[PDB]
Design a protein around this ligand. Structure first.
Ligand SMILES: [Zn+2]
Ligand SMILES: [Zn+2]
Lengths: 66, 100, 97
């Protein structure tokens, strides 16, 4: 939904969160999670792009894409 | 305190936090709804959200102009943050002026 | 950062416009002048004397007390630091980057 975290199983409402999280449609926990299922596939929130990529776009133990 | 390798440390002084709101292009990285000085873990608008640990009482914020770093509240002091440029070429440190 | 009893205080600003909301330094600047100036005495708008061969990004010098020679294109920043003449603080105003 428009006001919610974009992780498929997450319903956290972000209308009261910091603008950074509401802008990018992700709750704080899933922004830092090693992996979450987003749009049906395993993804990780890229610190550098502020958006999820699929896991193969990250090197080992990295929070931003290469 | 002045340079950490390739990263320049830039101390900029303001009358108060409201005067930063006129400072382009950096004002868009602040989150002016928040209390206490923050640093950014990345480059996005409103990305300076992480509470600096035990800050100097006149520190207003820290902006790293590139790259990424660990992003947590009340965990990193200003001196620790000066080691966390992680590739940033500039670390801008915003201060409120006080008269001695 | 010290010349005897004079503290030398370097302050770096976003731009010259940021100084205009700075009490007490705004009223000692003369914003009609261009190029960095220093004051020969304490009075409103007294920062009028041209600093000689000023460095890049220098915006002005304010001595917070006493008097000194007052003249254009004569005293470098370095010599001004010897010219406090009893001033307790010499504020040196810089533009960032
Ligand atoms: Zn979530
Ligand atoms: Zn990325």
């Amino acid at each position: 939904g428009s006001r919610l975290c974009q992780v498929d199983r997450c319903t956290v409402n972000l209308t009261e969160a910091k603008q950074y999280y509401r802008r990018h449609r992700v709750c704080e926990v899933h922004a830092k999670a090693s992996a979450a299922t987003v749009a049906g596939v395993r993804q990780r929130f890229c610190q550098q792009c502020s958006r999820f990529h699929e896991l193969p776009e990250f090197d080992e133990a990295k929070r931003s894409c290469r | 305190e002045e340079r950490v390798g390739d990263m320049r440390i830039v101390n900029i002084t303001f009358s108060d936090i409201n005067s930063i709101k006129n400072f382009q292009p950096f004002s868009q990285y602040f989150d002016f709804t928040l209390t206490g000085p923050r640093y950014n873990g990345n480059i996005a608008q409103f990305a300076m959200i992480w509470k600096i640990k035990n800050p100097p009482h006149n520190l207003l914020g820290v902006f790293f102009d590139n790259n990424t770093r660990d992003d947590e509240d009340d965990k990193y002091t200003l001196e620790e943050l000066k080691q966390m440029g992680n590739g940033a070429k500039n670390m801008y440190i915003f201060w409120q002026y006080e008269q001695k």
